[PDB]
Amino acid sequence: SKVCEISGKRPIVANSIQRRGKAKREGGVGKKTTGISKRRQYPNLQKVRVRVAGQEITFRVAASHIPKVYELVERAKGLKLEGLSPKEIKKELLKLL
């Protein structure tokens, strides 16, 4: 539940459609919708913890962009990052996007 710090993936609203009956393509009379109600589809958010500049940075990121966190860590090497706060490291890291 919430937002990928990397991809920006947010929760979206989707309908949940309940149907009944036999498809036409299978020779049935056709499908009848017996309900539509809203629901949400959440991003698959997980925690990735990483050490960068001897500090522990953690990201909330959709599983699809789990590799993008480590790629950020790589691009981090060219950076003067030590001495900074982990809030500060993450900001620099994020800025690399």
- In the complex, which residues of this chain contact RNA (CB under 7 A)? 1-3, 9-17, 19, 23-25, 27-36, 38, 40-49, 51, 54, 56, 58, 60, 62-64, 66, 87, 91, 95
Q: Is 44 in the site for another protein (CB under 8 A)?
A: no
Would you give the distance in Å from CA 62 to the centre of its chain?
A: 2
Shortest CB 70 distance to another protein, Å? 7
| Contact between residue 76 and residue 52 where contact means Cβ atoms under 8 Å apart | yes
Compute φ and ψ for 42, nearest 5 degrees: -90, 155
Interface contacts to another protein, rule CB under 8 A: 51, 70-71, 74
